[PDB]
Design a protein around this ligand. Structure first.
Ligand SMILES: Nc1ncnc2c1ncn2[C@@H]1O[C@H](COP(=O)(O)OP(=O)(O)OP(=O)(O)O)[C@@H](O)[C@H]1O
Ligand SMILES: Nc1ncnc2c1ncn2[C@@H]1O[C@H](COP(=O)(O)OP(=O)(O)OP(=O)(O)O)[C@@H](O)[C@H]1O
Ligand SMILES: [Mg+2]
Ligand SMILES: [Mg+2]
Lengths: 362, 364
């Protein structure tokens, strides 16, 4: 009957819905009773292909066809929760693809991204964030196509969702600003559950969430006041769910990983953004800081070299590469940011991200 | 028998009335059942022409026949919904506003904030800054220069005299609900107006909505219902900020054809915390903003725009590359100076009988 694949979502109550075409609650969704969920071993993020009875207000979804990876009898799935989470610098996500315009060799020498990492890009508005995210998505899709890239735009203009869909080869999930914050939270939750299920399958997943601050604000505005409402306009109980999202980024010793590259808003003129970013300090191992005052000088990507780095770099780079990168970082920390970024780009102009290593050692 | 003509409003329940007022719940509105809506392919905002029975008996007499929908046919209702259609960045085609040498309101707007078919504008203005004259000038320029665009002017809380003033000074549709009406009426008027704009865009036509005081719509939404979301926002409920965002975000271009411009106005420095909170919550949503400054208006210099924080986002697709370079140079020059000096210099140089003739002067 009605075949289209869609990510199933089990709402916290007894209701479970198949979000047709994904991921927002649509007007032609299909109802799933937990009887069928339990007799089928259904998770919270599977992609079903069942049929309906064409004439719970919605369809009954009788005669399920398939699940995301296997079938009904595939009830042997390793949970994300009760599972081992190694250090996750093991495998390296290469980002160098071209030399004419870099925008990624800098954030490759400065913030080595690895599979299963939990990155965080700090950026003031109008500093070069969307270009960086698009270039990261393109580099991830081209360098290693095995990664199941997906992009989550929690709160964006409808004009920008189309641009992202056209400039990114991966899957794009987005909720426009003209949606209730409940839709924002539901989309983020369903996206992270889909990523978790793909990890349990054994595939390296990359999630390029945009504006974790907007996700935190959506969680804040969705619910009324709660414990410790006095923090700057946001209650402390509303900063748990976003962390949970950012807490999903982990490696797996058996196989697979979940990389999350979220973006944080600072200097936005709202105290809530600064508060949310401050209470997120100490969770992301790799942090990249974009500086506004460097962007107005029309030099890009305009990263803050000194406060940007990666935790546990020993397991990502090769020992000789690690030594060279350490020497470069020491040299950059010797200088101030406004000159260090200029020197780094000046050296990177004439090289190909390896000749510079050859030049640096000399 | 009687032949009402009205724009249908489809309420959440099974009721559906045609608003032959229009757009305001009147004393006599023809009732339409859901069965008629489904059979005739009706949807909220459609312009409906049909017949109705004589008084027979249900306070409102149900509709009986239908002659036309939105000017078309009952069977020709195969138009695509707006939600499912692709929404480009909408700088593709710009609406020229400079129409005469004498008036410098539209010339300044064209130089500072270019407007294209599909923008989502926001005029930020304190009280007594020159907002109504600017809206009237924009409406006149749009009607004169772009007659193909269907012009709608929505007023949410206005004096009953100002509605007539606008109706006499504006040629397009003027929908208004005066302050002597419940906030539910302002809500219904705004929602029905935007749904009508959507239904016209689905036909491929260009619609331009001139909303007045999006803050008034936000306050009407806030007062219409008891607080249920995060009340701690500055006196205004957090749930009350969603429907105004929906109204403002309905302004999308269409790749298949059409556009829906929304030049809304936001009120700041009104002495109320609700207005400032709503405006702050509406940050980063509109891609064209014009800031009117009270202190510039007090100097009796108009249109009194605050140039530096006002501009269009992604105007590269609106302007030709040489014109874009010239405008970028002008914006750099203006940003070199403070607000008062910038507007004074712009007004002083704008008296060169055209905008293009100033651009030619700008090169040399
Ligand atoms: N790699 C790059 N090379 C050159 N210019 C760039 C680069 N990345 C961004 N820019 C500049 O940045 C602008 C494009 O917008 P940008 O990517 O900065 O938006 P953003 O950071 O998403 O901003 P916002 O918060 O408004 O959405 C242009 O001025 C463009 O020249
Ligand atoms: N283009 C213009 N040229 C000259 N004077 C102008 C112009 N536009 C507005 N004004 C002046 O503005 C006044 C007209 O009212 P105005 O447009 O300022 O009201 P408003 O912004 O709607 O105010 P309110 O907040 O009371 O509704 C007059 O003093 C008129 O001279
Ligand atoms: Mg952006
Ligand atoms: Mg006025």
């Amino acid at each position: 009957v009605v075949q289209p694949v869609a990510g199933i979502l089990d709402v916290l109550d007894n209701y479970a819905f198949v979000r047709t075409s994904g991921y927002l609650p649509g007007p032609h969704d299909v109802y799933v009773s937990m009887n069928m969920v339990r007799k089928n071993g259904m998770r919270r993020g599977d992609a079903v292909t069942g049929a309906v009875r064409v004439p719970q207000k919605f369809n009954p979804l009788v005669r399920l066809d398939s699940i995301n990876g296997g079938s009904v009898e595939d009830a042997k799935k390793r949970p994300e929760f009760g599972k081992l989470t190694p250090l996750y610098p093991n495998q390296r996500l290469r980002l160098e693809t071209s030399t004419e315009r870099l925008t990624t060799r800098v954030i490759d020498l400065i913030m080595p991204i690895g599979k299963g990492q939990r990155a965080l890009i700090v950026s003031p508005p109008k500093a070069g964030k969307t270009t960086i995210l698009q270039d990261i998505a393109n580099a991830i899709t081209r360098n290693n196509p095995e990664c199941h890239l997906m992009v989550v735009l929690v709160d964006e203009r409808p004009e920008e969702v189309t641009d992202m869909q056209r400039s990114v080869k991966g899957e794009v999930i987005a909720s426009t600003f003209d949606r209730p914050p409940s839709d924002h939270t539901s989309v983020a939750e369903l996206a992270i559950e889909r990523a978790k299920r793909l990890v349990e399958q054994g595939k390296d997943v990359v999630v390029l969430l945009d504006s974790i601050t907007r996700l935190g604000r959506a969680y804040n505005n969705a619910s009324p006041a709660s414990g410790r409402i006095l923090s700057g306009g946001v209650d402390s109980t509303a900063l748990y769910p976003p962390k949970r999202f950012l807490g999903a980024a982990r490696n797996i010793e058996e196989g697979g990983s979940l990389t999350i590259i979220a973006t944080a808003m600072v200097e936005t003129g709202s105290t809530g953004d600064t508060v949310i970013f401050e209470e997120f300090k100490g969770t992301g191992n790799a942090e990249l800081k974009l500086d506004r005052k460097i962007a107005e000088r029309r030099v890009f990507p305009a990263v803050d070299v000194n406060p940007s780095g990666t935790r546990k770099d020993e397991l990502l780079l090769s020992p000789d590469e690690f030594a060279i990168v350490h020497k470069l970082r020491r040299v950059l920390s010797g200088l101030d940011s406004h000159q260090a970024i200029d020197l780094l780009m000046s050296q990177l102009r004439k090289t190909k991200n390896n000749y510079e290593f050859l030049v640096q050692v000399s």
